[PDB]
């Protein structure tokens, strides 16, 4: 998305951290996924964390 809007804009996003591998696979098929967002100033790449939580 190019900010053709006529002012600065706030943009939120997220990454899903699943409970187990079965969730991971039945949601996104493959494992060892990545989420990468970037702008001119920004560069992020998170590798999600499967784990059993409270």
């Amino acid at each position, epitope marked *: 998305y190019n900010n053709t809007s006529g002012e600065q804009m706030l943009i939120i996003w997220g990454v899903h951290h699943p409970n187990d591998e079965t*969730e991971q696979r039945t949601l996104y098929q493959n494992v060892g996924t990545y989420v990468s967002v970037g702008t001119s100033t920004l560069n992020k790449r998170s590798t999600p964390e499967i784990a059993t939580r409270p």
Partner: antibody
Amino acid sequence: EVQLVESGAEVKKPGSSVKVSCKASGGTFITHVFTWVRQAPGQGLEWVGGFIAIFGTSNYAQKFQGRVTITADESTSTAYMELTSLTSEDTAVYYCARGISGSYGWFDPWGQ
Amino acid sequence: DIQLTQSPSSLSASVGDRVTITCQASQDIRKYLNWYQQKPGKAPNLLIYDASNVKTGVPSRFRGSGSGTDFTFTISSLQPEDIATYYCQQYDNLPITFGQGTRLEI
């Protein structure tokens, strides 16, 4: 391997109600996309229902919404459609089935 | 809901031929299509999924091909248990449409 036990056979008289069951095993309760297709005397094939157990969300065709509600229980691993206002564009054989992936993939076993 | 069209509703089972059923949608669906078998008037069964790949409870006797609006379910050399009506069905879109049937005899 994964199978699918439905309910009965009993057609009914217009104004009544149905609550077809469909429980499955051969795997864990998540995944499991429960789809339901009905077959009129002789004619085509007609998607009515769905339930996507990961979400707990549920989808219908819109020759219904109002009438049909579909649910489940994880403990009993049992699905559950409920067709109210039961006329004659409602008279068929009602197949439960297992499909895949949120957008209802391919339906791999079928009910008897 | 995006309206399939299994052409034609019945071919005539001349054994061994290039027996080819077609399935033509109301709009582009790319590769999200399935082919179902109904041996005699009861519970259907799945053969080809996702346009050109096979169920692995597998006939080498069969084939799926297609993408655009247009799809094709092929049986080459006929065999005497494959007596059925036949279905194409869809997602990509949302309320799950089918074809009507394509059925041939002995």
